[PDB]
Amino acid sequence: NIVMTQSPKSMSMSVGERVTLSCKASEYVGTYVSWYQQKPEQSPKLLIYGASNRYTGVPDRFTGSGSATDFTLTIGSVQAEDLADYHCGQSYSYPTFGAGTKLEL
Amino acid sequence: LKFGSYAYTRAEVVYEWTREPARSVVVAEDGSRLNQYDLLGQTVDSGIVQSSTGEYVVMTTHFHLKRKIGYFVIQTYLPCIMTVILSQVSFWLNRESVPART
Amino acid sequence: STGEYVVMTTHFHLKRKIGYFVIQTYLPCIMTVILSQVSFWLNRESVPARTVFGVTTVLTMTTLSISARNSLPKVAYATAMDWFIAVCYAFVFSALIEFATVNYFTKSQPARAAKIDRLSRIAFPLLFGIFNLVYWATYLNR
Amino acid sequence: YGYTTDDIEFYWRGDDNAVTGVTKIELPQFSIVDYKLITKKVVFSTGSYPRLSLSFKLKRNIGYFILQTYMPSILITILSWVSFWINYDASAARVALGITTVLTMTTINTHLRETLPKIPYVKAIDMYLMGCFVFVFMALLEYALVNYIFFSQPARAAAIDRWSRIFFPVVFSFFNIVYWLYYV
Amino acid sequence: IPCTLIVVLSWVSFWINKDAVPARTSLGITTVLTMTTLSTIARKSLPKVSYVTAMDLFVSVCFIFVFSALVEYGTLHYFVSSQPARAAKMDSYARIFFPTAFCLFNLVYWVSYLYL
Ligand SMILES: *[C@@H]1O[C@H](CO)[C@@H](O[C@@H]2O[C@H](CO)[C@@H](O[C@@H]3O[C@H](CO)[C@@H](O)[C@H](O)[C@@H]3O)[C@H](O)[C@H]2NC(C)=O)[C@H](O)[C@H]1NC(C)=O
Ligand SMILES: CCc1c(C(=O)OC)ncc2[nH]c3cc(OC)c(OC)cc3c12
Ligand SMILES: CCc1c(C(=O)OC)ncc2[nH]c3cc(OC)c(OC)cc3c12
């Protein structure tokens, strides 16, 4: 019902560079967005719940920025072990997920 | 419509919607006592508010209203148009009849 | 009927301030009466001007009476301000009647109409001054 | 409130005679046409709850409103009609009469205005006032057209004046009758 | 008293000359507007009762006198061209006729309400 579009579909850089992911909601979702990372051959792990709250056991490197429809995830000083997909999902209504973003190198 | 807890900071009491946030505020179909307004819908958000006593959780709900212009059109706009037209009528009066134009 | 009781009494002595009533009620009455006598100085020929002066002044006095009466609570007897409004109303009415008489006597005896016009001109301000002076001196000093 | 149909149940004791004293009730400007007693169950998110409804039907009295409002508007229309008899020469007199009639109608409309709440729709009394304003305004515009035409032809002015004099009362009567029949 | 004096005012038009048509028209309409506003002021202090009451009667009848005076003056102006002599006749006879009607009506009203 609510479409979540993740951009870019893929993007890469070397270790240490700032990397930002953008997810946009078709309709209004008021900070009920979440970010997950799915390592290869693994189940998703929650990273950011709510618009910006950081889940327990998560490095301070990850940070989330919120809005009514435009949301972004920034990984300050990306390390070399953050090489998993990244899914944005909204829970304002029955949950839906974005197409995911692939991160490599 | 914002509500939260008095005296229980976020570390002690946290609020949450029972169902999906989009379905947690229900408006009865037959209950609407609005005279000159229309209720388009509502949206819920949950945030945090800072205060001197601590940091609290706030549940927010917005009711979107649009005013109805029907009353004002008859009340003011049409009378203004008619007064302007009556004021115009003065042009067609004969120049001799000064008192009528005054 | 249930015994004798000790009653302790206190009286707070109040005096009213008049300025608001001056500005809202008396000054408009004086102005309207003055307008009524101003009516006399017009030319007899301009009948509509005098007619509208008379009608509008009488109407202003009526509306000021209904407006002034609403301030204080409804009461059977009459107040001083009510007498003042009544007398000013009488002056306006007499002025209008004087104009009507002059109109009637016009085109029959111009000299008599002019004489009554001058007599009314001299008389009305005098009578209003006498009435106003006596009323004010009466109520102010007591 | 707290007890569901599994816990409690309501009913009118002596159904017809359950509610009494309605007949003696009087209202300043309403008449109790009748009343009904219902008995149902309403389903909320927490369960089903018994409910009873006592509903009246109230009809307004038109005498008050007729006398207060309908008469003066028609009467202002009467004055607007009287304005025609006056000769075309007295432009100032007829113009003043008509404009003052307009203002008086506005005064009575205003006095109506303070009583009712703001509402998007147009009520019947508003419809009648609008219609009367249309009548008066068309009469005044007709006089303006007569004055403009007269200098071209005086006979045309006299004939058109007689024509309007005869018809405007007729059209007012027709509109009044159709309005009353529609709203009664 | 205000209604009585307004009805008294409506008379003065009669004494004025017929020629000053604008004056009579303006006076009549101003008096009508006055009677309307005074009727409106009177009613508000009362509860909204359907049945007619005595105060409604006096205001209504005074308003009728005002309207009748203005209408008769207008008809008089129209008839002047048709019959000026009849016009002056009607002015004089109106002057002498109406006052008796108003006074006898006043007396009848007052005595009838005193009787009950
Ligand atoms: C005032 O408005 C109320 C509410 O609209 C009216 O109450 C309605 O009354 C009718 C007749 O009693 C009800 O119809 C009944 O429905 C049941 C449903 O099963 C059916 O079994 C019966 O045979 C009957 O048809 C109607 O339900 C009821 N409305 C509601 C919302 O309960 C009332 O009649 C109106 N007038 C007065 C004077 O009260
Ligand atoms: C233009 C006449 C007027 C005046 C006035 O005297 O202006 C010259 N004043 C107040 C008014 N309220 C009105 C309400 C109406 O109906 C919705 C209406 O009809 C379209 C006319 C008026 C009206
Ligand atoms: C012009 C006098 C007048 C009249 C009138 O029509 O007399 C011709 N009517 C109502 C009035 N309300 C007033 C209030 C005032 O003070 C704020 C005031 O101050 C000088 C004068 C008036 C007044």
UniProtKB/Swiss-Prot annotation, chain B:
TM segment ranges: 73-93
Cytoplasmic side, ranges: 94-98
Subcellular location: Postsynaptic cell membrane; Cell membrane; Cytoplasmic vesicle membrane
Binding positions (3alpha-hydroxy-5alpha-pregnan-11,20-dione): 92
Note: Functions as a receptor for diazepines and various anesthetics, such as pentobarbital; these are bound at a separate allosteric effector binding site.
Disease field: Epilepsy, childhood absence 4: A subtype of idiopathic generalized epilepsy characterized by an onset at age 6-7 years, frequent absence seizures (several per day) and bilateral, synchronous, symmetric 3-Hz spike waves on EEG. Tonic-clonic seizures often develop in adolescence. Absence seizures may either remit or persist into adulthood. Epilepsy, idiopathic generalized 13: A disorder characterized by recurring generalized seizures in the absence of detectable brain lesions and/or metabolic abnormalities. Generalized seizures arise diffusely and simultaneously from both hemispheres of the brain. Seizure types include juvenile myoclonic seizures, absence seizures, and generalized tonic-clonic seizures.
Domain notes: The extracellular domain contributes to synaptic contact formation. The GABA-binding pockets are located at the interface between neighboring alpha and beta subunits.
Protein family according to the UniProt entry: Belongs to the ligand-gated ion channel (TC 1.A.9) family. Gamma-aminobutyric acid receptor (TC 1.A.9.5) subfamily. GABRA1 sub-subfamily.
Swiss-Prot record, chain C:
Intervals, Extracellular compartment: 70-79
Connected disease: Epilepsy, childhood absence 4: A subtype of idiopathic generalized epilepsy characterized by an onset at age 6-7 years, frequent absence seizures (several per day) and bilateral, synchronous, symmetric 3-Hz spike waves on EEG. Tonic-clonic seizures often develop in adolescence. Absence seizures may either remit or persist into adulthood.
List of residues binding 3alpha-hydroxy-5alpha-pregnan-11,20-dione: 41
Protein name, as recorded: Gamma-aminobutyric acid receptor subunit alpha-1
Subunit structure: Heteropentamer, formed by a combination of alpha (GABRA1-6), beta (GABRB1-3), gamma (GABRG1-3), delta (GABRD), epsilon (GABRE), rho (GABRR1-3), pi (GABRP) and theta (GABRQ) subunits, each subunit exhibiting distinct physiological and pharmacological properties. Interacts with UBQLN1. Interacts with TRAK1. Interacts with KIF21B. Identified in a complex of 720 kDa composed of LHFPL4, NLGN2, GABRA1, GABRB2, GABRG2 and GABRB3. Interacts with LHFPL4. Interacts with NLGN2. Interacts with SHISA7; interaction leads regulation of GABAAR trafficking, channel deactivation kinetics and pharmacology.
Residue ranges of the TM segments: 22-42, 48-69, 80-101
Highest taxon listed in the record's lineage: Eukaryota
Subcellular location: Postsynaptic cell membrane; Cell membrane; Cytoplasmic vesicle membrane
Additional remarks: Functions as a receptor for diazepines and various anesthetics, such as pentobarbital; these are bound at a separate allosteric effector binding site.
Side of membrane Cytoplasmic, spans: 43-47
From Swiss-Prot, chain D:
Highest rank taxon of the organism: Eukaryota
Stretches of the chain found on the membrane's Cytoplasmic side: 83-92
Residues annotated as transmembrane: 62-82, 93-112, 131-151, 164-184
Tissue: Isoform 1 and isoform 2 show reduced expression in schizophrenic brain. Isoform 3 shows increased expression in schizophrenic and bipolar disorder brains while isoform 4 shows reduced expression.
Subcellular location: Postsynaptic cell membrane; Cell membrane; Cytoplasmic vesicle membrane
Extracellular topological domain residue ranges: 113-130
Residues holding histamine: 46
Result for mutant: residue 97 to S: In IECEE2; uncertain significance
Residues involved in 4-aminobutanoate binding: 1, 46
Known function: Beta subunit of the heteropentameric ligand-gated chloride channel gated by gamma-aminobutyric acid (GABA), a major inhibitory neurotransmitter in the brain. GABA-gated chloride channels, also named GABA(A) receptors (GABAAR), consist of five subunits arranged around a central pore and contain GABA active binding site(s) located at the alpha and beta subunit interface(s). When activated by GABA, GABAARs selectively allow the flow of chloride anions across the cell membrane down their electrochemical gradient.
Family listed: Belongs to the ligand-gated ion channel (TC 1.A.9) family. Gamma-aminobutyric acid receptor (TC 1.A.9.5) subfamily. GABRB2 sub-subfamily.
Record's protein name: Gamma-aminobutyric acid receptor subunit beta-2
Source organism phylogeny: Eukaryota, Metazoa, Chordata, Craniata, Vertebrata
UniProtKB/Swiss-Prot annotation, chain E:
Residue ranges, Cytoplasmic side: 17-22
Protein name per UniProt: Gamma-aminobutyric acid receptor subunit gamma-2
Residues of the full protein shown: 281 to 361 of 475
Domain commentary: The extracellular domain contributes to synaptic contact formation.
Localization annotation: Postsynaptic cell membrane; Cell membrane; Cell projection, Dendrite; Cytoplasmic vesicle membrane
Function (record text): Gamma subunit of the heteropentameric ligand-gated chloride channel gated by gamma-aminobutyric acid (GABA), a major inhibitory neurotransmitter in the brain. GABA-gated chloride channels, also named GABA(A) receptors (GABAAR), consist of five subunits arranged around a central pore and contain GABA active binding site(s) located at the alpha and beta subunit interface(s). When activated by GABA, GABAARs selectively allow the flow of chloride anions across the cell membrane down their electrochemical gradient.
Transmembrane segments: 1-16, 23-42, 55-79
Membrane side Extracellular: residue ranges: 43-54
Organism: Homo sapiens (Human)
UniProt modification remark: Palmitoylated by ZDHHC3/GODZ; required for the accumulation of GABA(A) receptors at the postsynaptic membrane of inhibitory GABAergic synapses.
Family: Belongs to the ligand-gated ion channel (TC 1.A.9) family. Gamma-aminobutyric acid receptor (TC 1.A.9.5) subfamily. GABRG2 sub-subfamily.
